């Protein structure tokens, strides 16, 4: 694929019609059509009107009489809508019919009209001498040999040249022409040489390597700016063309080198022409903003010279001084040799310099369209930095980028209504246990919960989390884009929560369009609204679970409780408007009508009753624990007696509090109620408050009581914290390879030249760093970059500091992104629930590994992409055992990693475990190395072999995470399934095959018959807060519901020796 291959042909000649067709080239009969006769575009956001003509008329100098035509006054009839196609077509047709180029039709088949000169003579009303030539001898325009078409005019008139003005390709742009072409007498090569030698004496003048009609012609510019624009344009055309010549494509181009040669010019054009033959650009398919091209190409030049090795620099200078020469690759010259041999009389530019060797410069990325780049920085690279100076980041305006506290949720409409429920497990509640639970609960209520926990709970409000979604459902409604949804559907309900107006249906699926001129206001939901709707759905689904229409049965009542519940009542009412006889009562303190106002305890005379109850009453902020106890017990009693299907909030869901609730209901009704611990996805993600479903059933409940439950653990483990919670910093200075950085960001800006450096230093802390420029004019790249702790765990194991700094150099200046529009970023980004879970595990295991002594190494099995590396302290050696991980040996050497790319051998005999080592089987035993799910018995075999292998080793420790069977029975009950869901009984983590789960009792059973000491453990709340605050992550809305259950039922097994 070495040699260039191309067909050369003159388009300016091919486009010129045979004389017989000139009478009808105006198309007197047929009307003009888009994409054929012409093309038009109204550019929106800029209000411009581009009408370009096609065919021969694409090169057409208008007479002033042509400019007196209505067709040119047309854009003036606007702004701003695109000109109607009918008026455009009628006018343009009228004008087209108006032109009448002089000619004399002949019978000879060799001839063609010289369209340019005849059009030009029309343009000057045949006053110019070429014009009156065209009048007295129209035949002079017809020609067989393309060159003699002009020679006949140059000899008839005696002139040495003809200066033809060119119009803008767009004809609606009536403004000064950038330059003018000038045909020269030539025709011998020698005459051409002489002319070009004499052109060095002129001012602003340039030529293509070869010419149309084989007649030498030069461009003459009004000013150096116009010249620079022409040069940049043609440079982009030669670049784009040689890009496909190098790829071996046949090219039908008019000439081998589309770059101009500055016969006489300003220095900027010389540096353009110099950079042009270097061919620095990488191949690119993105659309360019041509309007700024010159600037781009100049800046590129300024950087190309700025970071090129000394020899390439001098080569650039040589091209820059000898600008009259046409620099070209050997393959180009080969093509010129061919096209000369075919046509000996062809004229080519004579002063050229062939590259014996093409320069070997790094290719530059050069996208100039919109979009921030999202780099993912590599840990290491060819460049070896040493003591690099700190890079200050400039402050950015709100206009460029804003930094809001929490990333809004982006879930599906149905997704927010799902809930997860934890069932009770223990069959009895011994008093000896009761003293312990009552004590732990009392101490917890007295010391209060973790400060960091409550900071996250208050910062990540669910209302703000769901605002972008609800507002969009509102906005599509008011502009009428919505129209079809099932009644009783979740989309129906959410529409009811979006808009404060009645929503009637006409027919079963169509919604009645709003009357013209009437736009309903947004519904004003307070924070607890969506939650109450989610609980209403939760009750409808607990009633049936096969339901698709969450709508009350006719003649049934529900009664929301708690302060300020009015919006939920108006929403439920408007949602059930088509259902006959639905009571939807509201109560609670600070209630306004419709809701009745009341305070706990309810007045003793009062007697509420309903088929459904939803208590959301808050605990009084300052009272004795026994006081809150009697209060919430009385609340549960009221809600339980009032309705067969209560759902009452527990603000302080201790084991003791909830179990005592079960005791209270048990002594209230005799037989135990079928209680459950629900947690909806419309709750604030960090809330430990949990709802308790309550219902009588004919079956006598077995295992009525809770113990070690997930929802309970979320509260119990939020003990008051040791240390004041971390606050996400926005770091501006970028020190090189300095370990000291609190969790947060790097938001700021720096000159594009320092950008490769900033990215190269950021990689020490940030896994990825979005960058962009506001515009081609502004020189500062903005950067936003989260500090990921994992990257810190990798990059600080050794003193070495390396990066892909040159690769980042390739971006300057156009490769780092562009964006005019404001960008918003967040102190707390969304990440999938499973990820947050893995982080909680890594925190649990990190906090465990730091405590243990004399541990030579951590060996993570199956840890792809060094996923477990955050766990291992920077000095200890870190072994990875996973077939999938791929590393250059020099990299592991650079960071003291030790990869062994073989599958781990789970057979007990050959499993060579070291003493003083910490094995990590986090999230690996469930799957075969190829990713296929293992049968659960195989996982039990795995844990058996690893404990039995651990039986001989001293000081060995292993963390074997595994899913527990209990979660399945919970997930079968729950509707939430955004990221965790059962599939024929195997739970499916996102982007993974569903896997069979183990029973914990059987696992501890085999683990104790093996006789190794072991501890089942799970990450708790403090680990959640540590992971979230450290990674800059906020828990998802659905994540808040599913996380407690998913985490509690994915125990780590801590084997130890």
């Amino acid at each position: 694929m070495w040699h260039y291959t191309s067909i050369n042909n003159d388009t300016r000649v091919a486009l010129d019609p045979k004389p017989n067709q000139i009478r009808t080239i105006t198309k007197p009969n047929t009307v003009p059509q888009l994409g054929t006769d012409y093309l038009y575009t109204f550019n929106s956001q800029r209000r411009s009107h581009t009408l370009r003509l096609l065919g021969p008329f694409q090169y057409f100098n208008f007479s002033e009489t042509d400019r007196g035509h209505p067709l040119f006054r047309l854009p003036l009839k606007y702004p701003s809508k695109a000109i109607p196609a009918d008026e455009l077509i009628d006018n343009l047709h009228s004008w087209m019919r108006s032109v009448h180029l002089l000619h004399v039709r002949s019978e000879d088949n060799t001839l063609r009209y010289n369209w340019m000169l005849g059009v030009y003579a029309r343009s000057t009303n045949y006053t110019t001498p070429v014009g009156q030539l065209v009048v007295n001898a129209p035949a002079i325009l017809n020609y067989s040999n393309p060159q003699d078409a002009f020679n006949s005019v140059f000899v008839a008139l005696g002139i040495d040249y003809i200066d033809i003005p060119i119009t803008n390709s767009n004809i609606f742009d009536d403004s000064s022409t950038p330059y003018n072409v000038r045909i020269w007498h030539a025709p011998t090569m020698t005459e051409v040489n002489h002319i070009l030698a004499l052109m060095r004496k002129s001012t602003l003048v340039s030529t293509h390597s070869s010419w149309h009609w084989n007649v030498l012609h030069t461009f003459h510019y009004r000013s150096e700016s116009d010249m620079i624009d022409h040069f940049a344009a043609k440079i982009l055309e030669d670049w784009r063309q040689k890009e496909k010549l190098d790829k071996g494509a046949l090219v039908e181009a008019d000439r081998v080198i589309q770059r101009l040669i500055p016969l006489s010019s300003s220095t900027y054009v010389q540096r353009l022409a110099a950079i042009g033959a270097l061919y620095p650009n990488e191949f690119t398919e993105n659309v360019l903003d041509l309007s700024r091209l010159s600037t781009a190409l100049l800046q590129l030049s300024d950087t190309y010279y700025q970071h090129a090795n000394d020899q390439l620099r001098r080569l650039y200078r040589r091209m820059y001084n000898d600008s009259r020469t046409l620099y070209m690759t050997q393959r180009h010259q080969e093509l010129l040799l061919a096209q000369i041999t075919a046509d000996p009389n062809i004229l080519l530019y004579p002063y050229t310099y062939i590259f014996t060797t093409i320069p070997t410069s790094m290719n530059y990325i050069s996208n100039t369209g919109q979009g921030r780049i999202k780099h993912s920085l590599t840990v290491t690279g060819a460049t070896e930095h040493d003591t690099v100076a700190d890079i200050v980041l400039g402050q950015t305006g709100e206009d460029v980028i804003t930094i809001s506290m929490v990333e809004p949720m982006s879930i599906a409409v149905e997704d927010m209504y799902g809930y997860v429920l934890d069932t009770p497990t223990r069959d009895i509640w011994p008093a000896d246990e009761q003293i312990e639970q009552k004590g732990d609960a009392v101490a917890l209520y007295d010391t209060k919960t973790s400060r960091a926990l409550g900071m996250f709970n208050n910062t990540v409000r669910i209302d703000d989390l769901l605002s972008p979604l609800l507002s969009l459902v509102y906005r599509t409604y008011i502009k009428g884009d919505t129209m079809t949804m099932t009644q009783g559907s979740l989309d129906h309900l959410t529409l009811c929560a979006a808009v404060d107006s009645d929503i009637t249906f006409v027919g079963n699926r169509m919604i009645a369009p709003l009357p013209e001129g009437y736009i309903p206001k947004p519904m004003h939901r307070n924070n607890s609204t969506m939650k109450m709707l989610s609980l209403y759905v939760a009750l409808k689904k607990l009633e049936n679970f096969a339901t698709n229409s969450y709508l009350m049965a006719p003649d049934t009542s529900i009664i929301l409780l708690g302060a300020e519940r009015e919006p939920a009542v108006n929403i439920l009412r408007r949602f059930n408007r088509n259902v006959s006889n639905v009571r939807i009562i509201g109560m609670g303190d600070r209630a306004v009508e419709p809701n009745i106002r009341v305070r706990v305890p309810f007045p003793i005379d009062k007697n509420i009753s309903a088929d459904f109850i939803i208590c959301d009453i808050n605990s009084y902020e300052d009272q004795s624990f026994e006081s809150m106890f009697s209060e919430t017990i009385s609340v549960v009693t009221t809600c339980a007696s009032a309705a067969t299907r209560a759902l009452v909030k527990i603000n302080h869901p201790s084991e003791y509090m909830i179990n005592s609730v079960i005791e209270r209901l048990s002594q209230l009704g005799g037989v135990f109620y079928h209680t459950a611990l629900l947690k909806t996805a419309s709750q604030n993600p960090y809330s430990y408050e949990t709802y308790i479903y309550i219902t009588p059933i004919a079956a006598a409940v077995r295992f009525p009581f809770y113990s070690n439950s997930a929802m309970i653990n979320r509260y119990m483990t939020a003990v008051a914290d040791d240390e004041m919670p971390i606050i996400p910093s926005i770091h501006t200075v970028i020190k090189g390879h300095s370990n000291t950085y609190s969790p947060g960001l790097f938001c700021g800006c720096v000159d594009v030249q320092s950008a490769p450096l900033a990215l190269s230093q950021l990689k020490s802390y940030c896994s990825e760093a979005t960058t962009w420029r506001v515009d081609s004019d502004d020189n500062l790249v903005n950067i936003i970059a989260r500090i990921d702790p994992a990257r810190i765990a990798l990059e600080f194991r050794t003193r070495s500091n390396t990066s892909a700094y040159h690769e980042y150099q390739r971006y300057v200046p156009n490769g780092l992104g562009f964006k005019v529009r404001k960008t918003r970023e967040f102190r707390y980004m969304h990440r999938e629930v499973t990820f947050i879970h893995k982080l909680m595990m890594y925190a649990l295991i990190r906090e465990q590994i730091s405590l243990t002594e004399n541990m030579t190494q951590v060996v993570s099995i199956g840890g792809r992409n060094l996923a477990d590396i955050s766990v291992v302290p920077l000095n200890m050696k870190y072994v990875v055992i996973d077939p999938a991980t791929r590393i250059e040996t020099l990299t592991q050497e650079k960071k003291n990693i030790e990869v062994q790319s073989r599958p781990f051998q789970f057979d007990a005999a050959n499993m060579d475990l070291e003493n003083n080592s910490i094995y990590l089987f986090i999230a690996v035993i469930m799957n075969e190395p190829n990713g296929a799910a293992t049968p659960a018995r195989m996982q039990m075999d795995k844990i058996r072999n690893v404990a039995t292998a651990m039986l001989t080793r001293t000081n060995c420790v292993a963390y074997i995470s595994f899913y527990e069977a209990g979660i399945i029975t919970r997930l079968d009950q729950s509707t939430a399934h955004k990221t965790i869901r059962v599939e024929e009984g195997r739970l499916k983590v996102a982007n993974y095959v569903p896997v069979d789960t183990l029973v914990e009792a059987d696992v501890t059973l085999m683990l104790r018959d093996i006789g190794i000491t072991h501890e089942i453990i799970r990450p708790s709340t403090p680990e959640l807060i540590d992971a979230c605050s450290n990674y800059g992550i906020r828990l998802g809305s659905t994540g808040g519901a599913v996380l407690d259950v998913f985490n509690h039922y994915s125990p780590v097994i801590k084997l130890v020796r």
Binding site: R47, E64, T65, G68, L76, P79, T124, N125, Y126, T127, T128, Q132, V135, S175, S176, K201, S202, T203, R222, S223, E224, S225, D226, I228, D229, S264, Y268, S294, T295
Partner: protein, 197 residues
């Protein structure tokens, strides 16, 4: 008043950046001829279209010259001194012999039609009496006929006087490229390294 508000808010003047775009001052201020030698241009003559001030821009397009930029051929063959690397003069109007109608004159008819609808729009704004309006129109028409009379003498006679005079030995400078929007004279100075240029 309104078109003027928009226009002068854009800037009384403009300069041309190396990219060649016009950048307007964004500021009201009277021109002084000092500025003529500077980087500054009056903004009425930019011919850069501006929304909501179209009438001013149009009335401005009336000012664009009807001639062409002749080369000084005979002064070159004579080796007559010329400061420019390529000497040129702007002849005010081309010769127009073949036509039934003089294009320069016709351009004056369009200019006058525009000013006529302008003066008319004013008179209706000010409730002016019909007689005086008809009189302004008769005066404009008369101007058109007068210009149509002399136009041949200008385009077809005076232009040649200009075209010779361009080649007179002492007419050594370049005066005008014919584009009001972007023309500054080349500015030479006689610089001693000691004293001021």
């Amino acid at each position: 008043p309104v078109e003027y508000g928009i226009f002068v808010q854009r800037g009384a003047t403009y300069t041309i950046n190396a990219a060649g775009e016009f950048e307007f001052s964004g500021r009201n201020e009277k021109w002084d001829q000092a500025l003529y030698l500077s980087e500054h241009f009056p903004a009425l003559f930019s011919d850069v279209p501006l929304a909501g001030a179209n009438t001013i821009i149009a009335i401005m397009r009336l000012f664009t010259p009807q001639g062409f930029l002749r080369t000084d051929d005979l002064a070159i063959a004579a080796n007559f001194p010329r400061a420019s690397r390529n000497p040129q003069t702007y002849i005010p109007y081309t010769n127009q012999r073949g036509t039934v109608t003089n294009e320069f004159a016709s351009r004056f008819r369009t200019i006058v039609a525009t000013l006529a609808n302008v003066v008319n729009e004013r008179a209706v704004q000010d409730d002016m009496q019909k007689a005086t309006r008809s009189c302004t129109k008769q005066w404009l028409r008369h101007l058109e006929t007068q210009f149509d009379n002399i136009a041949v003498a200008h385009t077809d006679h005076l232009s040649v006087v200009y075209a010779t005079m361009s080649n007179f030995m002492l007419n050594f400078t370049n005066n005008f490229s014919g584009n009001h929007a972007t023309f500054k004279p080349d500015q030479y100075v006689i610089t001693s390294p000691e004293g001021s240029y």
